[PDB]
Amino acid sequence: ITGRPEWIWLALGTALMGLGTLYFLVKGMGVSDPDAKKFYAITTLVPAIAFTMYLSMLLGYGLTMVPFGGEQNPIYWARYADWLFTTPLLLLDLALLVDADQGTILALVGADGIMIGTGLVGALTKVYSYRFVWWAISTAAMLYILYVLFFGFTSKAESMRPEVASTFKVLRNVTVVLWSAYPVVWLIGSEGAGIVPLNIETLLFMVLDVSAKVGFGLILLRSRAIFGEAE
Amino acid sequence: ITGRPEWIWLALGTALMGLGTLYFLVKGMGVSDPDAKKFYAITTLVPAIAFTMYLSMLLGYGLTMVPFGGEQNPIYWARYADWLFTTPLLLLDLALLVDADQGTILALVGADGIMIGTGLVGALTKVYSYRFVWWAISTAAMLYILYVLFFGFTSKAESMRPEVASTFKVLRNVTVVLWSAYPVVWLIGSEGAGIVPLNIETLLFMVLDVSAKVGFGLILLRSRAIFGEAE
Amino acid sequence: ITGRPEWIWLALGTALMGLGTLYFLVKGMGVSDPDAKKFYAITTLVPAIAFTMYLSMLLGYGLTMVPFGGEQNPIYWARYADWLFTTPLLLLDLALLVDADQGTILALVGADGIMIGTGLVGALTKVYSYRFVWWAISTAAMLYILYVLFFGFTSKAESMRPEVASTFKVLRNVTVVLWSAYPVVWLIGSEGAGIVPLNIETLLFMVLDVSAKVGFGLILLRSRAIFGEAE
Ligand SMILES: CC(C)CCC[C@@H](C)CCC[C@@H](C)CCC[C@@H](C)CCOC[C@@H](CO)OCC[C@H](C)CCC[C@H](C)CCC[C@H](C)CCCC(C)C
Ligand SMILES: CC(C)CCC[C@@H](C)CCC[C@@H](C)CCC[C@@H](C)CCOC[C@@H](CO)OCC[C@H](C)CCC[C@H](C)CCC[C@H](C)CCCC(C)C
Ligand SMILES: CC(C)CCC[C@@H](C)CCC[C@@H](C)CCC[C@@H](C)CCOC[C@@H](CO)OCC[C@H](C)CCC[C@H](C)CCC[C@H](C)CCCC(C)C
Ligand SMILES: *C/C=C(C)/C=C/C=C(C)/C=C/C1=C(C)CCCC1(C)C
Ligand SMILES: *C/C=C(C)/C=C/C=C(C)/C=C/C1=C(C)CCCC1(C)C
Ligand SMILES: *C/C=C(C)/C=C/C=C(C)/C=C/C1=C(C)CCCC1(C)C
Ligand SMILES: CCCCCCCCCCCCCCC
Ligand SMILES: CCCCCCCCCCCCCCC
Ligand SMILES: CCCCCCCCCCCCCCC
Ligand SMILES: CCCCCCCCCCCCCC
Ligand SMILES: CCCCCCCCCCCCCC
Ligand SMILES: CCCCCCCCCCCCCC
Ligand SMILES: CCCCCCCCCCCCC
Ligand SMILES: CCCCCCCCCCCCC
Ligand SMILES: CCCCCCCCCCCCC
Ligand SMILES: CCCCCCCCCCC
Ligand SMILES: CCCCCCCCCCC
Ligand SMILES: CCCCCCCCCCC
Ligand SMILES: CCCCCCCCCCC
Ligand SMILES: CCCCCCCCCC
Ligand SMILES: CCCCCCCCCC
Ligand SMILES: CCCCCCCCCC
Ligand SMILES: CCCCCCCCC
Ligand SMILES: CCCCCCCCC
Ligand SMILES: CCCCCCCCC
Ligand SMILES: CCCCCCCC
Ligand SMILES: CCCCCCCC
Ligand SMILES: CCCCCCCC
Ligand SMILES: CCCCCCCC
Ligand SMILES: CCCCCCCC
Ligand SMILES: CCCCCCCC
Ligand SMILES: CCCCCCCC
Ligand SMILES: CCCCCCCC
Ligand SMILES: CCCCCCCC
């Protein structure tokens, strides 16, 4: 395990996701409100899935070698397995907060699936120049998602409770900033142009992942917006 | 890319799915009705997914070699990845049109999953005679789906709005004819008996795919059946 | 096929799932009640999926070799493909019976996904001692599911119809006993410590699978709890 310099960040990531999972699990024990239960379920599952995939990367299972540029390049494929399930759960948290219509939710989840799926294909593609074609398609799917979060959701939040409108606005802003960093790190890291070494890349993704999951969850689950308006 | 004679049909397929995706995306921009949004979301996602998988076939990612009959046989596995997601979306379009009950929808999607999954296993099976066992099981799942579309849905459409009944009937008929061709092409093509060469097989699937997705979508999204009855 | 001593149990399993599938399919033909249709759909799909995966194991497709302990160890990976889809369907049968809230259903299905997914990783892991780390995480996800079935569902059933409360209690008890055997068989069988040989392991899983699917389904589909209260 320690044979890879990036192991320290995989281990820290595993620990922080594990701790985040346990914290949300305990916190949600005292919850009976049916609406709050939905948000706790979604939000606890996110770091639990990430915990398993960080562990698989730490132990070496979630790593494969991909030939491109005349080299055997270490590619952590387990990231995409994580993201396939956790990024639509994160979007679902946002969509339920603002009572999004079903068509909009399906558009978001579908675009998200395309985003992660094409990122996976790009990560595993052996023809170097083609990796960036997949990156571009994935990034276009991301831009669609960000567009919807701003010009379909923000003006939906404003007709809702003030506490859900303010909580949505904060989580929207956190999401757009954090999620936009992922394609940049991929592009300059070992999957793309290879300018930033894998150990630093792994650190960067770990900070983004913990912030986008445990950070996000801490903000959401401390808000009164997750509860039905009750006396 | 041009090293494979079937590349021209993969390229045309990619282009037509891409163009179809953009057309539906633009067309649905001016839509606020919650019901119509569902149909636009579902129907736009279908060629978008197909676009990505056609591209993966064009670039060579979605192709593998399978030993059977003492030969290395080129198998485009990306078709099944496409179909796994797009065929239940197509069925969902039909089921929502007639306000199908939840049990019926689950039966359809489940049978569809079995249909595509067993087709994939058959496509990748190395014992030649066993490929046709999987083809038979998949075809039985197809026949179940077609049965339900006729003797569970058609008489559901007739108690609904005339515009939804007439639109459903047309899309049902398009679906049954087009979908029934797929097992025949598989059986006589490079996956099955090998009587029709891969380049012609690829052409045939491209015509079926564009018709079943973009053709289907053009009929559906031009109907007033996708809108709630409103003043 | 007969080259593997466990083939007889794979063949019997295939037959019993096939027969169970046909029986439930015929039985549900005379059903119009929308609630009952849901239970028939879910419950018929379960042995149908299991039939396909038992067949893939019989024909040899669903088997791979995994190096650990200095040996090539036969691992039937198709079990996890089965279980990935059938165990959440089984939980859905239980959850719908007691009209579980959406948050609880998502927690169950999510924990179940983690349970099966980590079992799959453990089954395919090449470092022997690490296989048991994945077994432990999977078992913890199982224990969560069993906890919810007892201390979240049982007291939900009691405020419902007596026929649904009594049917739920029986199916809950069947589920907890049968499902708890699976991690034990894995641990002592060819995936784990290797004390029980593969042919006996295969027998054990076949008895558990038929009981947990066809047995379970026979109890559920003969109950009046699956019908809406109607005059
Ligand atoms: C509604 C939304 C969910 C829409 C989803 C959007 C989605 C369509 C976007 C594209 C997804 C698609 C790229 C998934 C591809 C998975 C694939 C990378 C798995 C690895 O297999 C690739 C090659 C080795 O590189 O296998 C070597 C050759 C092997 C023989 C491969 C044969 C097995 C195939 C992988 C079977 C395909 C199954 C499905 C792709 C399962 C989807 C997995 C998940 C990653 C989407
Ligand atoms: C409700 C509905 C959805 C019901 C669904 C119906 C469904 C049950 C029908 C059968 C689906 C099942 C056949 C999927 C099999 C996928 C498999 C072909 C992927 C390729 O792996 C096959 C061999 C190489 O040929 O791998 C070589 C050996 C490797 C070590 C394989 C180990 C990895 C396994 C593939 C893990 C299994 C994961 C699940 C099958 C994911 C499902 C993928 C999708 C195609 C259904
Ligand atoms: C809401 C709930 C559903 C939550 C779900 C919980 C879930 C997160 C729990 C963990 C699931 C995760 C372990 C699935 C891993 C599948 C993996 C074993 C498939 C086989 O690939 C493993 C190695 C060979 O051993 O591939 C060799 C290297 C290859 C290059 C691998 C590259 C292809 C990757 C497999 C692509 C990943 C796609 C997704 C994992 C699809 C999920 C399949 C299913 C088994 C969950
Ligand atoms: C918890 C993990 C999260 C929130 C991950 C988010 C990841 C993305 C938004 C990834 C986006 C990518 C692209 C837009 C193109 C390049 C490849 C990706 C997959 C890194
Ligand atoms: C957009 C793509 C569509 C509508 C594809 C439909 C495909 C089928 C109905 C495929 C059916 C098959 C069988 C019935 C058995 C042989 C294998 C298949 C998968 C080709
Ligand atoms: C129809 C099949 C059923 C009901 C299978 C149930 C399987 C399980 C509950 C498996 C549990 C496992 C663990 C808890 C850890 C070890 C690995 C598994 C996957 C066997
Ligand atoms: C969105 C953030 C992307 C920028 C990442 C900056 C990383 C700077 C680290 C120094 C680069 C290491 C190069 C020498 C090894
Ligand atoms: C459902 C349509 C299946 C029939 C396809 C007919 C294809 C005819 C093309 C000629 C066959 C090529 C054989 C000589 C290369
Ligand atoms: C939950 C049941 C697990 C116990 C399984 C008992 C199997 C006993 C069979 C005898 C073991 C075979 C060892 C000699 C080959
Ligand atoms: C490819 C995996 C996509 C599914 C991820 C799980 C999250 C799905 C959330 C469903 C949202 C509800 C839509 C109506
Ligand atoms: C194996 C992939 C199956 C899922 C495909 C996505 C479409 C699912 C549509 C869900 C229909 C709603 C059922 C209640
Ligand atoms: C990884 C596969 C998980 C999906 C299995 C299919 C069963 C899903 C049942 C959905 C229950 C409804 C939740 C709201
Ligand atoms: C186009 C929608 C406006 C809100 C999205 C902001 C786009 C940020 C760009 C992210 C950088 C990705 C490379
Ligand atoms: C049995 C249901 C009647 C409607 C379905 C028509 C079946 C068409 C056969 C398709 C050919 C597949 C090989
Ligand atoms: C902790 C919840 C109480 C009900 C679950 C009973 C646990 C049975 C243990 C199963 C054995 C697995 C190794
Ligand atoms: C070796 C790099 C070749 C450049 C490929 C860039 C493709 C980016 C596509 C953006 C439309
Ligand atoms: C080499 C071909 C052997 C014939 C197999 C046909 C099987 C079809 C099954 C239909 C019930
Ligand atoms: C070779 C076996 C080494 C023992 C591993 C047991 C790990 C079990 C983890 C339970 C917390
Ligand atoms: C990680 C295993 C958890 C089993 C005990 C249940 C914890 C309490 C959860 C309350 C919903
Ligand atoms: C509760 C702490 C969980 C941390 C387990 C994984 C950390 C890796 C240590 C090497
Ligand atoms: C908008 C046109 C999209 C076409 C891109 C793929 C066509 C392949 C050209 C070689
Ligand atoms: C209807 C009987 C189904 C049995 C088919 C599979 C049994 C395997 C026989 C070798
Ligand atoms: C993006 C950083 C999130 C910070 C989380 C802090 C949570 C405290 C309530
Ligand atoms: C099956 C062929 C479909 C033809 C689509 C034409 C759409 C015009 C409205
Ligand atoms: C766990 C054993 C189940 C027994 C099923 C018998 C069904 C008869 C109604
Ligand atoms: C990591 C366990 C958290 C302890 C409880 C925190 C207050 C709910
Ligand atoms: C008003 C919300 C500001 C949140 C910005 C957080 C940036 C990481
Ligand atoms: C809305 C601001 C987006 C900031 C992008 C930051 C990418 C590192
Ligand atoms: C391909 C872009 C379509 C242009 C608009 C067509 C009329 C909505
Ligand atoms: C009355 C509907 C006829 C549609 C037939 C289309 C055949 C491709
Ligand atoms: C309902 C008519 C079906 C026609 C099947 C055509 C197969 C090529
Ligand atoms: C296996 C076929 C079952 C025959 C009908 C049983 C009574 C519904
Ligand atoms: C009162 C229900 C008892 C069911 C026990 C079944 C054990 C297999
Ligand atoms: C509730 C009793 C569980 C029995 C476990 C049996 C495991 C073989």
PDB file of all heavy atoms in Angstrom, chain A residues 193-209:
ATOM      1  N   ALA A 193      -3.263  15.983 -19.504  1.00  0.00           N
ATOM      2  CA  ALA A 193      -1.986  16.493 -20.012  1.00  0.00           C
ATOM      3  C   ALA A 193      -0.768  16.065 -19.177  1.00  0.00           C
ATOM      4  O   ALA A 193       0.369  16.174 -19.634  1.00  0.00           O
ATOM      5  CB  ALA A 193      -2.048  18.017 -20.113  1.00  0.00           C
ATOM      6  N   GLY A 194      -0.997  15.596 -17.953  1.00  0.00           N
ATOM      7  CA  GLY A 194       0.085  15.045 -17.145  1.00  0.00           C
ATOM      8  C   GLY A 194       1.059  16.070 -16.571  1.00  0.00           C
ATOM      9  O   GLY A 194       2.203  15.744 -16.274  1.00  0.00           O
ATOM     10  N   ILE A 195       0.598  17.304 -16.402  1.00  0.00           N
ATOM     11  CA  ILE A 195       1.434  18.384 -15.881  1.00  0.00           C
ATOM     12  C   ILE A 195       1.556  18.330 -14.364  1.00  0.00           C
ATOM     13  O   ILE A 195       2.593  18.650 -13.799  1.00  0.00           O
ATOM     14  CB  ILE A 195       0.875  19.763 -16.274  1.00  0.00           C
ATOM     15  CG1 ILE A 195       0.654  19.855 -17.780  1.00  0.00           C
ATOM     16  CG2 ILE A 195       1.821  20.875 -15.826  1.00  0.00           C
ATOM     17  CD1 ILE A 195      -0.312  20.958 -18.159  1.00  0.00           C
ATOM     18  N   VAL A 196       0.472  17.947 -13.705  1.00  0.00           N
ATOM     19  CA  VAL A 196       0.462  17.792 -12.255  1.00  0.00           C
ATOM     20  C   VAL A 196       0.606  16.303 -11.951  1.00  0.00           C
ATOM     21  O   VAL A 196      -0.104  15.495 -12.536  1.00  0.00           O
ATOM     22  CB  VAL A 196      -0.836  18.360 -11.650  1.00  0.00           C
ATOM     23  CG1 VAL A 196      -0.976  17.989 -10.190  1.00  0.00           C
ATOM     24  CG2 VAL A 196      -0.872  19.881 -11.829  1.00  0.00           C
ATOM     25  N   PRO A 197       1.543  15.935 -11.064  1.00  0.00           N
ATOM     26  CA  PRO A 197       1.767  14.510 -10.791  1.00  0.00           C
ATOM     27  C   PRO A 197       0.613  13.860 -10.015  1.00  0.00           C
ATOM     28  O   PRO A 197      -0.155  14.544  -9.349  1.00  0.00           O
ATOM     29  CB  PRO A 197       3.064  14.507  -9.973  1.00  0.00           C
ATOM     30  CG  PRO A 197       3.216  15.874  -9.459  1.00  0.00           C
ATOM     31  CD  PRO A 197       2.570  16.790 -10.445  1.00  0.00           C
ATOM     32  N   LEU A 198       0.512  12.542 -10.117  1.00  0.00           N
ATOM     33  CA  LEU A 198      -0.594  11.786  -9.535  1.00  0.00           C
ATOM     34  C   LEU A 198      -0.778  12.021  -8.042  1.00  0.00           C
ATOM     35  O   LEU A 198      -1.911  12.084  -7.569  1.00  0.00           O
ATOM     36  CB  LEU A 198      -0.396  10.291  -9.797  1.00  0.00           C
ATOM     37  CG  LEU A 198      -1.514   9.348  -9.334  1.00  0.00           C
ATOM     38  CD1 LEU A 198      -2.860   9.814  -9.835  1.00  0.00           C
ATOM     39  CD2 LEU A 198      -1.232   7.930  -9.817  1.00  0.00           C
ATOM     40  N   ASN A 199       0.316  12.125  -7.284  1.00  0.00           N
ATOM     41  CA  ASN A 199       0.167  12.319  -5.849  1.00  0.00           C
ATOM     42  C   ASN A 199      -0.504  13.653  -5.523  1.00  0.00           C
ATOM     43  O   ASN A 199      -1.382  13.710  -4.656  1.00  0.00           O
ATOM     44  CB  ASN A 199       1.524  12.179  -5.117  1.00  0.00           C
ATOM     45  CG  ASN A 199       2.477  13.322  -5.390  1.00  0.00           C
ATOM     46  OD1 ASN A 199       2.729  13.683  -6.538  1.00  0.00           O
ATOM     47  ND2 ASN A 199       3.032  13.890  -4.323  1.00  0.00           N
ATOM     48  N   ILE A 200      -0.136  14.722  -6.224  1.00  0.00           N
ATOM     49  CA  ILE A 200      -0.810  16.004  -6.005  1.00  0.00           C
ATOM     50  C   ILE A 200      -2.250  15.986  -6.525  1.00  0.00           C
ATOM     51  O   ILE A 200      -3.150  16.514  -5.886  1.00  0.00           O
ATOM     52  CB  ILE A 200      -0.048  17.166  -6.663  1.00  0.00           C
ATOM     53  CG1 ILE A 200       1.372  17.238  -6.103  1.00  0.00           C
ATOM     54  CG2 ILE A 200      -0.772  18.489  -6.400  1.00  0.00           C
ATOM     55  CD1 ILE A 200       1.417  17.301  -4.582  1.00  0.00           C
ATOM     56  N   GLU A 201      -2.459  15.379  -7.689  1.00  0.00           N
ATOM     57  CA  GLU A 201      -3.809  15.174  -8.217  1.00  0.00           C
ATOM     58  C   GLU A 201      -4.708  14.470  -7.186  1.00  0.00           C
ATOM     59  O   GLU A 201      -5.859  14.852  -6.966  1.00  0.00           O
ATOM     60  CB  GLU A 201      -3.751  14.353  -9.514  1.00  0.00           C
ATOM     61  CG  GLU A 201      -5.133  13.954 -10.067  1.00  0.00           C
ATOM     62  CD  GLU A 201      -5.030  12.990 -11.241  1.00  0.00           C
ATOM     63  OE1 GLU A 201      -3.960  12.942 -11.869  1.00  0.00           O
ATOM     64  OE2 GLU A 201      -6.005  12.262 -11.526  1.00  0.00           O
ATOM     65  N   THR A 202      -4.167  13.449  -6.539  1.00  0.00           N
ATOM     66  CA  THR A 202      -4.952  12.661  -5.592  1.00  0.00           C
ATOM     67  C   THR A 202      -5.349  13.505  -4.379  1.00  0.00           C
ATOM     68  O   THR A 202      -6.476  13.418  -3.882  1.00  0.00           O
ATOM     69  CB  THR A 202      -4.157  11.413  -5.158  1.00  0.00           C
ATOM     70  OG1 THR A 202      -3.882  10.617  -6.318  1.00  0.00           O
ATOM     71  CG2 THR A 202      -4.918  10.584  -4.148  1.00  0.00           C
ATOM     72  N   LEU A 203      -4.413  14.325  -3.911  1.00  0.00           N
ATOM     73  CA  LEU A 203      -4.679  15.304  -2.860  1.00  0.00           C
ATOM     74  C   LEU A 203      -5.807  16.246  -3.246  1.00  0.00           C
ATOM     75  O   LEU A 203      -6.733  16.457  -2.482  1.00  0.00           O
ATOM     76  CB  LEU A 203      -3.408  16.113  -2.568  1.00  0.00           C
ATOM     77  CG  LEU A 203      -3.622  17.327  -1.672  1.00  0.00           C
ATOM     78  CD1 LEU A 203      -4.155  16.883  -0.323  1.00  0.00           C
ATOM     79  CD2 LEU A 203      -2.285  18.042  -1.517  1.00  0.00           C
ATOM     80  N   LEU A 204      -5.717  16.814  -4.442  1.00  0.00           N
ATOM     81  CA  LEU A 204      -6.721  17.759  -4.926  1.00  0.00           C
ATOM     82  C   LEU A 204      -8.128  17.151  -4.956  1.00  0.00           C
ATOM     83  O   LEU A 204      -9.084  17.752  -4.463  1.00  0.00           O
ATOM     84  CB  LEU A 204      -6.330  18.264  -6.308  1.00  0.00           C
ATOM     85  CG  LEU A 204      -5.089  19.155  -6.378  1.00  0.00           C
ATOM     86  CD1 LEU A 204      -4.680  19.429  -7.825  1.00  0.00           C
ATOM     87  CD2 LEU A 204      -5.363  20.452  -5.638  1.00  0.00           C
ATOM     88  N   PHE A 205      -8.257  15.959  -5.535  1.00  0.00           N
ATOM     89  CA  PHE A 205      -9.546  15.266  -5.560  1.00  0.00           C
ATOM     90  C   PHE A 205     -10.048  14.924  -4.163  1.00  0.00           C
ATOM     91  O   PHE A 205     -11.258  14.897  -3.923  1.00  0.00           O
ATOM     92  CB  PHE A 205      -9.441  13.974  -6.379  1.00  0.00           C
ATOM     93  CG  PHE A 205      -9.595  14.164  -7.868  1.00  0.00           C
ATOM     94  CD1 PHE A 205      -8.762  13.489  -8.752  1.00  0.00           C
ATOM     95  CD2 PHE A 205     -10.576  14.987  -8.388  1.00  0.00           C
ATOM     96  CE1 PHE A 205      -8.902  13.630 -10.119  1.00  0.00           C
ATOM     97  CE2 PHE A 205     -10.704  15.153  -9.771  1.00  0.00           C
ATOM     98  CZ  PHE A 205      -9.865  14.461 -10.628  1.00  0.00           C
ATOM     99  N   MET A 206      -9.136  14.624  -3.249  1.00  0.00           N
ATOM    100  CA  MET A 206      -9.552  14.304  -1.889  1.00  0.00           C
ATOM    101  C   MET A 206     -10.157  15.528  -1.210  1.00  0.00           C
ATOM    102  O   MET A 206     -11.208  15.442  -0.585  1.00  0.00           O
ATOM    103  CB  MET A 206      -8.383  13.769  -1.061  1.00  0.00           C
ATOM    104  CG  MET A 206      -8.871  13.204   0.261  1.00  0.00           C
ATOM    105  SD  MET A 206      -8.498  14.323   1.598  1.00  0.00           S
ATOM    106  CE  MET A 206      -6.790  13.901   1.725  1.00  0.00           C
ATOM    107  N   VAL A 207      -9.495  16.674  -1.325  1.00  0.00           N
ATOM    108  CA  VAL A 207     -10.083  17.908  -0.787  1.00  0.00           C
ATOM    109  C   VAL A 207     -11.432  18.265  -1.414  1.00  0.00           C
ATOM    110  O   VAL A 207     -12.373  18.643  -0.710  1.00  0.00           O
ATOM    111  CB  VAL A 207      -9.112  19.088  -0.973  1.00  0.00           C
ATOM    112  CG1 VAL A 207      -9.758  20.409  -0.565  1.00  0.00           C
ATOM    113  CG2 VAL A 207      -7.850  18.818  -0.165  1.00  0.00           C
ATOM    114  N   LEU A 208     -11.523  18.157  -2.735  1.00  0.00           N
ATOM    115  CA  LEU A 208     -12.787  18.412  -3.421  1.00  0.00           C
ATOM    116  C   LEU A 208     -13.861  17.428  -2.960  1.00  0.00           C
ATOM    117  O   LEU A 208     -14.988  17.830  -2.654  1.00  0.00           O
ATOM    118  CB  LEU A 208     -12.602  18.321  -4.942  1.00  0.00           C
ATOM    119  CG  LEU A 208     -11.757  19.415  -5.598  1.00  0.00           C
ATOM    120  CD1 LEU A 208     -11.554  19.076  -7.086  1.00  0.00           C
ATOM    121  CD2 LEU A 208     -12.452  20.770  -5.444  1.00  0.00           C
ATOM    122  N   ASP A 209     -13.520  16.139  -2.916  1.00  0.00           N
ATOM    123  CA  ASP A 209     -14.515  15.114  -2.556  1.00  0.00           C
ATOM    124  C   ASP A 209     -15.057  15.310  -1.136  1.00  0.00           C
ATOM    125  O   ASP A 209     -16.249  15.218  -0.904  1.00  0.00           O
ATOM    126  CB  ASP A 209     -13.919  13.695  -2.655  1.00  0.00           C
ATOM    127  CG  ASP A 209     -13.778  13.178  -4.086  1.00  0.00           C
ATOM    128  OD1 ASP A 209     -14.338  13.757  -5.042  1.00  0.00           O
ATOM    129  OD2 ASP A 209     -13.108  12.132  -4.240  1.00  0.00           O
TER     130      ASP A 209
END
